[PDB]
Design a binder for these strands. Structure first.
Lengths: 176, 38, 131, 141
RNA sequence: AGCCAGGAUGUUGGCUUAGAAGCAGCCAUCAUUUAAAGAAAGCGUAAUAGCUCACUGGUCGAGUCGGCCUGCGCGGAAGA
């Protein structure tokens, strides 16, 4: 509820449309839209955006705090744009992009080609690293989860697609 | 995953969650503390 | 911490000694380690002893409550990391620009120390010392 | 002494050299040449006491440059020195060993108080005094 | 509660000292230095260490923490 009380401040140029429960934000990076739960009173009423519980709903302050932090990261995404950074540690692992398609070679008997949704811009600074940018914080975490799901960081040599910040905990071979 | 009838926090880092009507125990430190039931 | 007066027994002990003292400074360590306190109070260990204070109580109404008792102008020193450097022995004593050495010594930023009362000035280097 | 990657605290034996089941690869896992350390320490054994658990603070630099910082022996083994009763805790509170005074113990505390980290030399001896019954000793008063 | 800091000095503490180094088992568990930091909280090491942790500063700005007694619920709950 502390996050519900602290309002979000829309920067310059970032549009806001409130036709009831549907919220449309137009920005520099792109245009995000989000329909909220039917238990929040989002009142622009000013520059900033505040969030209040609508009448009757018992989890009004529960739905309020998730309405803020959605629209908080939503207005960050249209201005700065979120970046997920991945890393292909493992011998003979390659990453490359061809448009909205990421080509991966993770030691399989066939290449895996993951097609990005509309809104993701992936590039390869080196061949063992994936950095992708996009507007929505939710959708770049989802496509980072799908690329990690192809080859998880096994706990012995750490081989596999991992996040760049993610720590991995290794084990030892049993005794011999 | 230790299925039980009585889950408890074993590690200091063990946390109780209530996903989908089931009570789990998630420990970020240890994977042998991953429990569910009860 | 304990109840109301135990939170404020040091705040009435804040100004009882600088009632007969007059000058002080500012120190802080957002990088330095215990060897700073172990040796810059060994600096106090050769100056007077223990109670050359390095107390860190500048919370937004904690030392601000202890501020209108003595040296009224230090109410604007309420924000981020501040420790009050109490010293009696010697008008313009030893610990006056050894903090300028401490800018280099092991406590990389000393919270932009400058010195407040009786040079009758803010920022101006403390160099007129009666030794 | 640099920061801690190969920084250790060591020297089970001072008068004895290279105690390999005590220390051995305790620094050899960090791989420091202790052969340059010991004959240097034999030149550091020019002035003071012999055959005693005296510790050391060792950190090396990036390019094999080595550095020791020795201190006085620990206050738990300072009780065995000025008193002559080479025993300690085991279970100390019901272990009776012996007793010497604050005026007997202070002779070696005349040197080590600057070697220790304090300004109260009358209280760095109290780091032996409360150690005494924690190693089963009494203090004459 | 986060966030930005410290988290040490005696001291491998005699010891089972084969070593347990604040981190297996003994028993102590005091003192330096204090803004505060545990002869140590747990992880990780053959032995250190790493690493955070209590504790202790700053920020922010309000309630927060843990038991007790009860109402109704949840899991425990697999069969032809």
């Amino acid at each position: 509820s502390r996050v519900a009380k602290a309002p979000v401040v829309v920067p310059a140029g970032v549009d806001v449309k409130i036709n009831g429960q549907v919220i449309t934000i137009k920005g520099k990076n792109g245009e995000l839209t989000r329909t909220l739960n039917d238990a929040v009173e989002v009142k622009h009423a000013d520059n900033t955006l505040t969030f209040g519980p609508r009448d009757g709903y018992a989890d009004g302050w529960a739905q309020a705090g998730t309405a803020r932090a959605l629209l908080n990261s939503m207005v960050i995404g249209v201005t700065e744009g979120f970046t997920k950074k991945l890393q292909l540690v493992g011998v003979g692992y390659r990453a490359a992009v061809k448009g909205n398609v990421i080509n991966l070679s993770l030691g399989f008997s066939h290449p895996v080609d993951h097609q990005l949704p509309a809104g993701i811009t992936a590039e390869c600074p080196t061949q063992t690293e994936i950095v992708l940018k996009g507007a929505d914080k939710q959708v770049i975490g989802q496509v980072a989860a799908d690329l990690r799901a192809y080859r998880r960081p096994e706990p012995y040599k750490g081989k596999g697609v991992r996040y760049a910040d993610e720590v991995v905990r290794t084990k030892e071979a049993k005794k011999k | 995953m230790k299925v039980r009838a009585s889950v408890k926090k074993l590690c200091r880092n063990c946390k109780i969650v209530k996903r989908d009507g089931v009570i789990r125990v998630i420990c970020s430190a240890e994977p042998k503390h991953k429990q569910r039931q009860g | 911490m304990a109840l109301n007066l135990q939170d404020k027994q040091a705040i009435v002990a804040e100004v009882s000694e600088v009632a007969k003292g007059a000058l002080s400074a500012v120190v802080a360590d957002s990088r330095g380690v215990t060897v700073d306190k172990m040796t810059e109070l060994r600096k106090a260990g050769r100056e007077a002893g223990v109670y050359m204070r390095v107390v860190r109580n500048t919370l937004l109404r904690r030392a601000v409550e202890g501020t209108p008792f003595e040296c009224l102008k230090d109410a604007f020193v309420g924000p981020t990391l501040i420790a009050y450097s109490m010293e009696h022995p010697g008008a313009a004593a030893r610990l006056f620009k050894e903090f300028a050495k401490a800018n280099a010594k092991f406590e990389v930023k000393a919270a932009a120390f400058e010195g407040e009362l009786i040079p009758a000035s803010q920022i101006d280097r403390l160099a007129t010392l009666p030794t | 002494a640099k920061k801690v990657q190969a920084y250790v605290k060591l020297q089970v034996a001072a008068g004895m050299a290279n105690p390999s089941p005590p220390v051995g690869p305790a620094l050899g896992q960090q791989g420091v040449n202790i052969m340059e350390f010991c004959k240097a320490f034999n030149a550091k054994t020019d002035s003071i006491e012999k055959g005693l658990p005296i510790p050391v603070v060792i950190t090396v630099y990036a390019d094999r440059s080595f550095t020791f910082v020795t201190k006085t022996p620990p206050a738990a083994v300072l009780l065995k020195k000025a008193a002559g009763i080479k025993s300690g805790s085991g279970k100390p509170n019901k272990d009776k060993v012996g007793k010497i005074s604050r005026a007997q113990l202070q002779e070696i505390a005349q040197t080590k108080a600057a070697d220790m980290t304090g300004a109260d030399i009358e209280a760095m001896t109290r780091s032996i005094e409360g150690t005494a019954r924690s190693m089963g000793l009494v203090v004459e008063d």
